[PDB]
């Protein structure tokens, strides 16, 4: 169980990292879509 | 020196004295310690040094000298 | 393992009695036929000593 | 959850530590008894392997 927990910790960290990147991407997309809503209202 | 630990513990675990053990011999058959006795010896060595030895490495102590080789 | 475990104690008791018996004698037994032939030698010694 | 299992590992480790002291201390006495018993008792009289 000790070695299993070490391995599981490593994998868990990897998944957390890729989700952090997607969170940043989501904020960027929100910026772009705010601009998009403004454009719709302008048209 | 620090080896006095091993060369002491071995005897205390096998009934032989400090000088009885010979580096050329093997615990499994040349000291009379069977499977259970050798498990007890390796596990007592583990206890004394407050460390850990997995099964694979632990199985490589059949000879007298090995008890110090992994230690020092 | 269950079969062997059930069988073991009987075999061990039998072996202790056998070792005691043959050690009590000068000759060491190894088989049923061997025990029988030892019976016969014992009878011959009876009928000479008598 | 996995951090709490790690703390389980620590608790189990100290349990193992306790068991280990038990084992080594027991052997220390086994040594002495089997030293003294070699006055022919262990041969078959005390060692009732049945």
UniProtKB/TrEMBL annotation, chain D:
Coiled-coil zones: 1-22
Domain of life: Bacteria
Location within or outside the cell: Cytoplasm, Nucleoid
UniProt free text on domains: The hinge domain, which separates the large intramolecular coiled coil regions, allows the homodimerization, forming a V-shaped homodimer.
Family indicated by similarity: Belongs to the SMC family. MukB subfamily.
Function description: Plays a central role in chromosome condensation, segregation and cell cycle progression. Functions as a homodimer, which is essential for chromosome partition. Involved in negative DNA supercoiling in vivo, and by this means organize and compact chromosomes. May achieve or facilitate chromosome segregation by condensation DNA from both sides of a centrally located replisome during cell division.
Subunit structure: Homodimerization via its hinge domain. Binds to DNA via its C-terminal region. Interacts, and probably forms a ternary complex, with MukE and MukF via its C-terminal region. The complex formation is stimulated by calcium or magnesium. Interacts with tubulin-related protein FtsZ.
Protein name: Chromosome partition protein MukB
Organism this protein belongs to: Photorhabdus thracensis
Encoding gene (name): mukB
Covered range of the whole protein: 1088 to 1137 of 1482
């Amino acid at each position: 169980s000790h070695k299993q927990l070490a391995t599981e910790q490593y994998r868990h960290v990897e998944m957390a990292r890729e989700l952090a990147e997607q969170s940043g991407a989501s904020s960027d997309l929100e910026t772009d879509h705010q601009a998009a809503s403004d454009h719709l209202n302008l048209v | 020196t620090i080896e006095e630990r091993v060369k002491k513990i071995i005897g205390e675990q096998l009934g032989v004295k400090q000088e009885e053990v010979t580096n050329n011999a093997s615990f499994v058959e040349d000291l009379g310690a069977d499977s259970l006795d050798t498990v007890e010896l390796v596990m007592a060595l583990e206890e004394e040094f407050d460390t850990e030895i997995p099964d694979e490495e632990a199985e490589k102590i059949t000879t007298v000298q090995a008890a110090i080789d992994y230690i020092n | 393992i269950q079969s062997l475990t059930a069988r073991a104690p009987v075999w061990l008791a039998a072996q202790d009695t056998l070792n005691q018996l043959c050690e009590q004698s000068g000759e060491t037994l190894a088989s049923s036929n061997d025990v029988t032939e030892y019976m016969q030698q014992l009878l011959e010694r009876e009928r000479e000593a008598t | 959850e996995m951090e709490n299992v790690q703390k389980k590992l620590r608790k189990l480790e100290r349990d193992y530590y306790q068991i280990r002291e038990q084992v080594v201390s027991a052997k220390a006495g086994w040594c002495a008894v089997m030293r003294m018993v070699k006055d022919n008792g262990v041969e078959r009289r005390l060692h009732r392997r049945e």
